[PDB]
Every structure is written in structure tokens, then in C-alpha cells.
Subunit: 241 residues, 4 copies
């Protein structure tokens, strides 16, 4: 806090700043979707490859700026910690072989979420219900793990594509949980060899399904036992006073 | 408003009018479903091709009439703006090659919704919940867009049917969202070439699913935090008075 | 009402009666499931074919009896009107070619629902929510009908198995509504010929899905705006008195 | 209750005890997942086969101990009755041919549920909603049974894989209930021979679906008519006093 600090802070904290970024984002958003056509890249492919590190430099400056204005507060903000890591990726140079990072650059278009406050709101609402589910996700993951281990031991030797491995079996059990091809694609083939295999997967389909449904019912029915306490408290008070 | 205006207004606004239309609709409804059989069209196919522009002329008159009675109010009514556009299509002449318009004529059977007030009610109820979802639809569409761009770049070269293009990838990601063949039909083929592809689509299946469920829970649990404010307000008042 | 009438009424209305029937039902239930094995029918197949019209005669008597005791009240009771029609079928003689009626006999095992009061309760609960949905089922059926007509006209010539006919198209559109193979099995084949076919089925999948979800939300959120009126009425009263 | 009894009781009831078990569990959990790789078992396969009956003996002692401390109370506790039966299996010797029991040993990893109180909580919540559903599960199972019998009689001769048998038909009807391949995989093949087969499976798909949805709505809407009685009772009381 001083003369020079405050000068920057008023740039960074301005609405022009955030809108310039939001524009860059929507602009580089469109550019990244045009960068998708081989036709376009043969023609205008240099313009957008240059338009790209333009936005990357701007976003780096813009991040640098925000870290000066916000100090340690910046690395405790989940919203901006994101932009940090998402612009960080987009800075790793395109020449190192690893395809996964060149494509990671598109993750910068998620700044439109952190930048726009209406978007931040939804994400925070959606994220907010996760912490209560951690217990049930742990139970479910344990349940998957126990069953993935059993299926490997039961079906992996004859059915190695689907169950040869703790991971192949995790994958198949998830597919079964999504109910996708679970009978025609998986369990019926299984039963030509293991006639009682339906005794494994139907109860799995029952339990995994039952938990999913209850999880939702618990959310709804618990989210509104709370509104019914608040409201009686506000009703008990006006009948006393 | 005058002698001549009021004469028409009493025709248009009558219940005979709306019922005559509702009858024409249900009648041309049935005719359009009989127009479906080649057998029937070989025999009675002229009767119904003529019965058709009969209804079209009537409906045009009927629309003309309603515009005189209702003035500028007509082009601010969503319900009637529809019948306008839906009869407008049915007027474009059958001879111009474009198959899409000849079939559009069946959209006139949706006038049974605008005509019948019980139907209008449901549609308005269903439409009414959309405006609050616009934020989440925007988030989801952005999310699809970011992922459609990544998948094109990741899988389009080897898997051009499913991911060769921003649109092919949109399509596949929607199919994956519907969970249809997502593992047997898509992700398992993908993994013969891209062993880690499950790292893209499971989290996509998780996020897209999670949002869908939360959207519903939000509707229910928010639609009824409101009833719990109204009711305490009506309870706080009678304990004060 | 008299000496002779009352004698029968006390048989019919007894608990021994209903339990004898409930036993016959569970007994003929088991018999009808054993009648399923060719092995068993080669051995004991006469015992159960005779055990069958035994139960049929008993059930006819039992129905006759109940009609005397209950008079016109019997043909206004949905529960017993059922047993009437379900035993009526089981009386039509096995020799007339029509396979559909021989198998209809198994419908008598549904008397265990009408007989047992715990069962009647659920069915009445489940049936009870249907009447409010009649509007939306009508809207949906109209919507299917309009779209089934369009799809026949659009895809039936090249794709006659799936869309050759108003009924083939109804069937496919339902399958699409269940999301079953909708993309791999139907819409993707369609698009090799009709590249824009996704413009028909995605919006269909959107609308049909949207309505389904809203129907449920409406049930829940409306079933409990009522409990919130009852309860404020009971709360407003005790604050007045 | 005495000097010697109390000495053991203070071991068993200690937190060190339960944590030692919880550690053994998570340790043997990891071991059972490593026991999955043929690579690992070629190397360290003896260490973990020995680490296994180590844990089994400990768990037997640990169970013996708990039965002394808890007396008849132990065989009335569902939580510990489980560990009993789950360690009991793991004690049956690996040499008797029956593959099903060697794999059952993994069920011991479910002790992490009974051991950890956060886990016990969820399971008890989830289990708690089952008793009210027993009626509807009975109705559904009856409904399946009636339909499984009809389908065997209707489609089993031509379609023995799917409907040759009361059990094959149960299986298929469940698959149809999960909607998995129900049209492409089952009903469409059926209709090449039985053109009206859609008259069996669509109503089955309707009823079975309808019940599922209503079951959930009943849970939610009934779980919270109760909160609305409790809260008015607590509101009626403070307006009287
Ligand atoms: C969130 C996004 C996560 C997506 C990760 C999965 C996608 C994926 O595997 O994409 C392919 C890349 C790069 O190819 P890679 O798997 O290295 O080689 C494939 C074999 N080839 C080139 C010789 C035909 O593979 C990787 O990037 C592997 C990353 C781990
Ligand atoms: C309510 C929500 C309930 C969620 C319950 C848990 C869901 C787990 C979802 C399944 C995850 C999955 O696909 O696991 C695969 C991985 C890696 O196995 P891997 O053998 O590398 O790959 C399998 C496919 N292959 C052979 C063709 C390359 O296997 C693993 O490494 C296990 C990953 C477990 C993640 C748990 C997250 C929660
Ligand atoms: C009861 C409490 C339990 C708590 C502990 C849970 C965590 C234990 C982790 C154990 C990891 C075991 C890894 C493992 O076995 O790797 C298997 C394979 C590699 O097999 P590999 O040895 O390469 O090939 C063997 C030869 N072959 C090809 C002929 C079969 O590679 C794979 O399949 C990948 C490994 C996937 C691991 C998934 C871990 C899920 C964690 C769930 C935690 C639940 C907590 C509540
Ligand atoms: C909760 C609700 C969440 C909804 C999230 C967004 C859902 C998007 C659904 C997917 C739409 C879709 O199929 O996009 C296809 C189009 C056109 O691509 P196009 O390459 O013309 O056609 C693909 C198929 N082909 C090559 C065989 C002709 O691709 C586009 O042009 C993109 C259309 C985006 C529409 C977004 C509507 C919301
Ligand atoms: C971060 C903020 C982002 C905001 C901006 C979002 C809108 C950007 C629109 C970009 C449109 C890009 C269109 C495009 O690249 O067309 C691709 C293809 C035509 O490819 P084409 O050049 O014919 O063929 C190349 C050669 N080949 C066949 C060998 C591959 O044709 C297609 O694939 C059809 C184009 C489908 C466009 C779908 C647009 C979805 C908009 C989502 C908006 C989300 C807002 C929150
Ligand atoms: C509720 C239950 C409704 C079930 C109706 C659909 C079942 C179905 O179609 O079952 C087959 C029967 C009898 O066979 P049907 O369709 O008369 O002849 C098949 C051709 N064949 C014998 C020469 C191979 O077909 C019928 O029973 C047709 C009934 C209309
Ligand atoms: C929320 C609930 C929304 C429900 C909306 C309506 C659902 C309609 C479900 C579809 C019914 C269906 O499969 O229709 C087929 C029939 C008969 O067509 P048909 O050509 O006899 O048989 C088609 C199959 N084939 C050629 C192999 C024999 O086609 C018809 O005859 C039409 C039947 C319409 C029944 C509407 C019931 C409501
Ligand atoms: C806008 C208001 C509308 C209100 C009226 C709705 C009811 C209209 C009923 C019209 C019935 C039309 C029947 C019809 O066209 O039959 C078509 C086929 C028989 O075709 P066919 O003439 O044997 O074969 C022609 C030659 N071929 C094989 C080369 C194509 O056979 C079939 O496809 C069976 C017919 C299925 C009829 C389904 C009716 C659904 C009613 C939905 C009502 C919604 C009300 C809100
Ligand atoms: C809401 C919840 C609604 C639940 C309604 C009931 C769901 C029943 C689920 C279907 C169970 C199932 O798959 O049944 C199969 C068994 C055994 O038949 P089986 O012939 O041994 O095996 C069939 C497969 N095969 C020939 C390849 C070996 O068939 C039986 O033995 C019947 C088992 C009935 C269990 C009912 C549990 C409730
Ligand atoms: C209306 C009240 C009803 C209450 C009673 C319900 C229980 C009745 C149980 C009847 C059990 C019938 C067993 C049976 O028939 O076994 C059939 C097959 C064995 O056939 P099999 O004789 O080996 O082979 C015949 C020759 N072949 C291969 C050429 C066809 O093997 C199988 O398919 C396995 C048997 C599966 C039985 C599933 C039982 C479900 C119980 C549902 C109870 C609902 C209660 C509300
Ligand atoms: C009961 C179940 C499962 C855990 C269990 O059964 N034990 C858990 C999992 C998700 C949890 C809810 C969400 O977190 C949202 C919200 C957060 C607030 O902070 C407290 C209220 C509320 C409604 C939570 C209540 C409850 O905790 C839920 C339903
Ligand atoms: C919270 C979520 C997602 C948006 C977000 O999380 N931000 C949004 C999306 C759909 C929205 C509801 C519907 O619109 C129906 C209705 C309209 C009324 O006008 C106000 C009340 C109500 C219940 C809305 C509340 C809330 O706004 C919802 C649940
Ligand atoms: C609003 C929607 C759709 C119709 C529409 O939007 N118009 C309709 C369809 C199903 C209807 C409910 C059920 O019938 C059960 C119940 C019957 C009682 O009698 C009155 C209350 C309740 C909760 C009904 C309220 C409402 O009527 C619902 C939600
Ligand atoms: C009405 C339906 C179906 C049975 C039927 O309709 N008859 C049944 C099946 C599941 C039942 C609920 C659960 O058990 C959970 C809970 C247990 C409490 O103890 C009492 C309250 C509550 C909410 C139950 C209410 C009701 O009983 C339900 C909804």
C-alpha cells in the first residue's frame, strides 16, 4: 500500500480490466474453435497462432498484476489459483512431444467461468453439495474396489479385456453402473462360461443403483429439513413476541 | 373500435370460432396421419390433398380475422405468433424441392396446443422453469465446447467419424452424455489406440451427470424454499394479529 | 337381505373365505410356475392341469357368491371388476387356437393384489397420481404423433424398418425416448443418408426428456405445496385460538 | 463381570484395539489389491499369503475377544454378526475346489465399514429406507413373476436364450427394466417372429418404470410430510404457550 502500488491496483480492479480479459477469452475462445479446421489453419493459421501467445502474454501480465494487487490473498483464492494453473499450462512451450499439454491450452477457455460472476455462482453452488457426499463416495469407491478385486479373480482369466486387471475391472464395473451394454455386452457373454455370473452383477447393479438414488433423496430431503427449522424458529419467535 | 370492427370481433372471439378451428385441427390431424399410408393415398389421396388447402385457407382467414380483432396485441402474443409462423410455413407452395418445408406442414397440428387452454397451461408451466436454467445451460454448453475442441484435437485424426470435427465431437459428447454405447461403442474402441482415453470421458461423464442431477435438485429444493417463506409470512401475520 | 341371503353373506365376508382364496392363489401361483418346466409337465402335468380348473371353478363360485352378497356394488368396485374379468378369461376354453388367451390365465395371479389389502394400498397410491398427468400424457402423445408423422415422411423411404409407417416411427421414437441405441443404432445410420437428421432427434430427445423430468418435479413440488397449506391453516388456527 | 473379565474388556473396548484392526484392514486391503498382479505374486507372493493368515488369526482372536466382552449382545448386533460371518468365510481352508469361497475372503475388506463409525452411519441410513419399500418390492417381484411366466410361454420356444425358462425370462425382463438393448437387442428380434411383441414389453417398460419413479417420489414426498407435522406441533405449542 503506497503511491505506486495503488496505481496498479486501480487498473487491475477496474471493470475495463476484467472486461478486456473477458473479451480476450471469448475472442480466443472463438479462435481456438476456428483453429480446429484444417481448411482455416492452412489459410489464417499464422494469425491465430500469433493471436494465441498475444493472449498468453496479456494473461501472464494480467496474472502478474493481480498477484501484486492481491498479495498472499491471491494464492488462497480458489478462483484465481485456477487461472494461475490454467495459464501456467498454456505457457509450457509447444515443443516437447507431450500431446496432452498442447491440448490443455483449451482449458484457458474456462477462465470465462472464473471471470464471469454469474458462472462462478453456479460452480460454487454445484461444488457446494460435494463435501457432504464425501462419505458416500468413499463407501462407493470402497465397494467398487472390493468388487473390482473379486471380478478380476473371478472373470479375468477367461475375460481379460474386461476383467484381466484391477483397472480393467474398475472400468467394466463403472460401465455396468452406467448400465451401458451391461447385459448384452458384458454379463451375457460372461454367462456362457460362468452361468452364475448374474449373481455378481445384478446385486452390484442393485446396490450401486440404490446408493445413487438415495444420495439424491438424501440431498433433497435433508436440504429442506433445514428450511423447516429456520422457518419454525422464525415462527416461534413472532408467537413469543 | 366501431360498428364494422365489432361485428368481426364477435365472430372471432366466439366459442364457435375456436371450436370450429379445434375441429379443423383434429380433423386435419387425422387426415395428416391417414396421408401417411400409400394405400390410402392411392385411393382417397385427392380428397385429403384438397381437404388440406381448405384447412389452410380457413386458417389464413382465421389468422387474418384474429389480427384485425387483436391489432398489435397479436404480434406480442407468443401463443398466436406461433400459429402465425406455423400457418405461414403451410402456405409456402409445395413445389420448390426443399423436402423440409412440405413436412413442416405437420407443425400445424401443434395448434391444438395453442387452441386448447388445458394444453397451453402445461406448456407454460414447462417453459416457465427454463429461464432459471439459462445460466447452467450456458455453463454446460461452454463445457461441451471446451471438451469438443479437446476431443477433436485428441481423437479426430484416428477416429474421424466420431471426433473428426467440432461438430462430430459435439455429437459424440452428447451421445456420451446420454450414456448411449459410451463404453462399448466409443471409449473402448478409443482405448485400443489411446489407452488413457478413459481419463477424458469418465470425468466428462461425471461432470455432465453431476450437473444434470444438481439442476433437478436445485429446481425442487429451490421451488419449495419459496413456499416456506410465503407460509411463514402468512403465519407470522396471524400471530401478530 | 333375508334368512337365506344372510347365510351366504357370512361365508363370503368371512376371513376364512378370503384366506382360502389367497391360499388357492399362492398355490396356483406356484403351480403356474412349475407348469413352466417341460420336465415337470411330462411327469406331474396332469395333476396341475386338473389342479387348474379346480381353482377356476372355485374362483367362479367364489365370484358368483360375491356378486350375490354385493349386488350392484360388485360391478362398481374396480378391485372386484378386475377379478371378474381376470377369472372370465381363465374360463374361455383352451381350444380355440388363440395363444394370447391361454397365457392370459396367468393374469389370475394378480388376484393376490386385489385379495391382499397391503397390495391394494400401493396400487391405489400408484394409480392415484395418474389422473393429474393425463394432460401431460396427452401433450406427449400429441408430440409423438406429430413427430411420428414427420419421421415417416422424412426417413421411411430409405429406412423402412424403423420409419416406414406411423407405427414403426412411433416405436422408434419411443426407443429414442428410452435413449436405447438412439445414436449408434438409429441416428448415426440415419445420418449416412440424411446428414442433418440430428436436427430432428436431438430436439426430440431434449423435449421428451425435459417433459419427463418436469413431470416428476411437478409431482414432488406440487404434492408438498399442499402439505404447506394444510400446516399453515393448522398453525393459523392455534394462533387465533 | 469380575477381575479377569474386566481386564480383557479394557483391551477390546480401547481405541488402540479398533485402530489396530482398522489398520490391519487397510493394510490387508492394499495387500489384497496387490495380490491381484501376477507380476507381484511371482515376487512377493509368499509375504502376502503369509501376511494373510496373520490378519486372519488376529481377526479371529479379535472376534473371540469381542464375544467374551459382549456376551449374547454380540450375536444380536448386526454390525458384528457381519464381521463374524465375514471372518468365518476367510477361515474355511483354501483347498476344497470351490472358487467362490477363496474370493469371498475379499469380503473382509467390508470390515472397514463396520469398523469406521462414519461408514456405519451411511449404511444405516441407506438400509433404513428399505423396510418401507418391502411392499412395493413384493408387488414388483410378483409383477416380474407373472410376466416372466407369460414370456416363457410366449417367446421361449423360438427365443430360448432369452426366454426359454422362468429364469431366462426373469433375467431378460430385468435387462428390459434397465432399458439395456431392450429394443435393438431384444424386442426388435422378437418382432420378426411375433409382430405384436411390443404389446408385451412397452407396457412392461411403462409399469416397471412408473413404479420406480413413484417409489422415489413417495420416499421424498412422504419423508417430508413428517417434518411438516413435527414443525407445526412445535409451532402450535409456542402459540399456546
Ligand atoms: C482431461 C484430459 C485428459 C485426456 C487424456 C487421455 C487422452 C489421450 O490419451 O490422448 C492421447 C495422448 C497422446 O498419445 P499417446 O497416448 O502418447 O500415444 C498414442 C499412440 N500413438 C500416438 C503411437 C498412436 O495420450 C496422453 O496424452 C496420455 C496422458 C496421460
Ligand atoms: C457416486 C460416485 C461413485 C464413484 C465410485 C468410483 C468410480 C470409479 C470409476 C472407474 C474408474 C476407472 O475407469 O478406473 C480405471 C483405472 C485405471 O485402470 P487401467 O488398467 O490403467 O485402465 C483400464 C483401461 N485400459 C486397460 C484399457 C487402459 O483404475 C484405477 O486406477 C482406479 C480409479 C479409481 C477412482 C475412484 C474415484 C472416485
Ligand atoms: C479395505 C481398504 C482398502 C484400502 C486400500 C485401497 C488401495 C489399494 C491399492 C492397490 C493397488 C494395486 C495395484 C495393482 O495390483 O496393479 C494391477 C495392475 C498392474 O498389473 P501388472 O502387475 O502390471 O500385470 C500382471 C500380469 N498380467 C498382465 C498377466 C495380469 O494395474 C492396475 O490395475 C492399476 C491399479 C488400479 C488401482 C485402483 C485403486 C483404487 C483405490 C480405492 C480406495 C478405496 C478407499 C475407501
Ligand atoms: C442441460 C443441457 C446441456 C446441453 C449442452 C449442449 C448440448 C449440445 C448437444 C450436441 C449438439 C450436436 O449434435 O451438435 C452437432 C452440431 C453440428 O455438427 P455437424 O458437423 O454439422 O454434424 C455432426 C454430424 N454429422 C457430421 C454426421 C453431420 O454441432 C454444432 O453446431 C454445435 C451445436 C451446439 C448447440 C448447443 C445447444 C444448447
Ligand atoms: C471460451 C468462450 C467461447 C465462446 C465462443 C464459442 C463459439 C465459437 C464458434 C467457433 C466455430 C468453429 C467452426 C469450425 O471450426 O468449423 C469446423 C467444421 C468445418 O470444418 P472444415 O474447415 O470444413 O474442414 C476441415 C478439414 N477436414 C475435413 C479434413 C477436417 O464445422 C463444424 O464443426 C460446425 C461448427 C460447430 C460449432 C459449434 C459452436 C458451439 C458454441 C458454444 C458456445 C458456448 C458459449 C458459452
Ligand atoms: C399383455 C400381453 C400381450 C402380449 C401380446 C404379444 C405377444 C405375441 O405376439 O405372442 C405371440 C402370439 C401368438 O402367435 P402369433 O403372433 O399369432 O403367430 C406368430 C407366427 N407363427 C406362430 C407362425 C410363428 O401373438 C398374439 O397373441 C397376438 C395378440 C395380439
Ligand atoms: C410420459 C409418457 C409419454 C408417452 C407418449 C406416447 C408413447 C407411445 C409409445 C409407442 C407405442 C408403440 O410402440 O406404438 C406402436 C403402435 C403399433 O404400430 P405397428 O405398425 O402395429 O407396430 C410397429 C412394430 N412392427 C411394425 C414391427 C409390428 O403404434 C400405434 O398404434 C400408436 C400407439 C400410441 C399409444 C399412446 C399411448 C400413450
Ligand atoms: C392434431 C390432432 C390429431 C388427433 C388425431 C390423432 C389420431 C389419428 C389417427 C390416424 C391413423 C392413421 C393410420 C395409418 O395411416 O395407418 C398406417 C399403417 C398402415 O399402412 P398401410 O396403408 O397398410 O401401408 C401403406 C403401404 N406401405 C406399406 C408401402 C407403406 O398402420 C399403422 O401405422 C398403425 C396406425 C398407428 C396409429 C397411431 C395413432 C396415435 C394417436 C395419437 C393421438 C394424440 C391425441 C392428443
Ligand atoms: C424395485 C426393485 C424391483 C425388483 C424386482 C425383481 C427383480 C428380479 C431381477 C432378476 C433376477 C434374475 O436375474 O433372475 C435369474 C434367476 C435364476 O435363473 P437361472 O435360469 O438360474 O439363470 C438365468 C441365466 N442363465 C440361464 C444364463 C444361467 O431367476 C430366479 O431364480 C428369480 C430370482 C428373483 C429374485 C427377486 C429379488 C427381488
Ligand atoms: C401368485 C403368487 C405366486 C407365489 C409363488 C411364487 C414362487 C413360485 C416358484 C415356482 C418355481 C418354478 C421353478 C421352475 O419351473 O423351474 C424352471 C427352470 C428349470 O426347468 P427344467 O425343468 O430344468 O427344464 C425344462 C426343459 N427345458 C430345458 C427344455 C425347458 O429353472 C428356473 O427357471 C429357476 C426357477 C426360478 C424361480 C423364480 C421364483 C420367483 C419368486 C417370486 C415370488 C413373488 C412373490 C410375491
Ligand atoms: C445424508 C447424506 C449422506 C451422508 C450420510 O448418510 N452420512 C448427505 C450427503 C449430502 C449431504 C447434504 C449436502 O452436503 C448439501 C447440504 C450441505 C450442508 O452443509 C448440510 C445440509 C446438506 C443438505 C447435506 C445433508 C446431508 O449431510 C447429506 C444429504
Ligand atoms: C439454482 C439453479 C441454478 C442456477 C444457479 O445456481 N445460479 C436455478 C436453475 C433453475 C432455477 C429455478 C427455476 O427457474 C424455477 C423457479 C423460477 C422462479 O422465478 C424462481 C424460483 C425457481 C425455483 C428457480 C430457483 C433457482 O434460480 C434455480 C433452481
Ligand atoms: C402440474 C402437473 C402437470 C399438469 C399441468 O402442468 N397442468 C400435474 C401432473 C401431476 C399432478 C399431481 C398428481 O395428480 C398428484 C396430486 C393429485 C392431487 O389431486 C392434486 C395434487 C397433485 C400433487 C397433482 C398436482 C399437479 O396437478 C400435478 C403435479
Ligand atoms: C408410500 C411408499 C410405498 C408403500 C405404499 O404405498 N403402501 C413407502 C415406501 C418407502 C416409505 C418410506 C421409507 O420407508 C422411509 C421412511 C420410513 C419411516 O419409518 C416412515 C416414513 C418414510 C418416509 C416412509 C414413508 C412411506 O411408507 C414410503 C414412502
Amino acid at each position: 500500500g503506497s503511491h505506486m502500488y495503488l496505481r496498479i491496483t486501480n487498473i487491475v480492479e477496474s471493470s475495463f480490466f476484467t472486461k478486456f480479459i473477458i473479451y480476450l477469452i471469448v475472442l480466443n475462445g472463438i479462435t481456438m474453435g476456428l483453429e480446429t479446421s484444417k481448411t482455416f489453419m492452412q489459410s489464417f493459421g499464422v494469425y491465430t497462432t500469433l493471436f494465441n501467445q498475444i493472449v498468453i502474454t496479456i494473461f501472464t501480465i494480467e496474472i502478474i498484476l493481480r498477484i501484486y494487487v492481491h498479495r498472499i490473498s491471491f494464492f488462497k483464492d480458489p478462483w484465481s489459483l485456477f487461472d494461475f494453473f490454467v495459464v501456467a499450462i498454456s505457457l509450457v512451450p509447444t515443443s516437447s512431444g507431450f500431446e496432452i499439454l498442447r491440448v490443455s491450452r483449451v482449458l484457458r477457455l474456462f477462465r470465462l467461468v472464473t471471470a464471469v460472476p454469474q458462472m462462478r455462482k453456479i460452480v460454487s453452488a454445484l461444488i457446494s453439495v460435494i463435501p457432504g457426499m464425501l462419505s458416500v463416495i468413499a463407501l462407493m469407491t470402497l465397494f467398487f474396489y472390493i468388487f473390482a478385486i473379486m471380478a478380476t479373480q473371478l472373470f479375468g482369466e477367461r475375460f481379460p479385456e474386461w476383467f484381466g486387471t484391477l483397472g480393467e475391472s474398475f472400468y467394466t464395473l463403472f460401465q455396468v453402473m452406467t448400465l451401458e451394454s451391461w447385459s448384452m455386452g458384458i454379463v451375457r457373454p460372461l454367462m456362457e462360461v460362468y452361468p452364475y455370473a448374474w449373481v455378481f452383477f445384478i446385486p452390484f447393479i442393485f446396490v450401486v443403483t440404490f446408493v445413487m438414488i438415495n444420495l439424491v433423496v438424501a440431498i433433497i430431503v435433508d436440504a429442506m429439513a433445514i428450511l423447516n427449522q429456520k422457518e419454525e424458529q422464525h415462527i416461534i419467535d413472532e408467537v413469543q413476541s
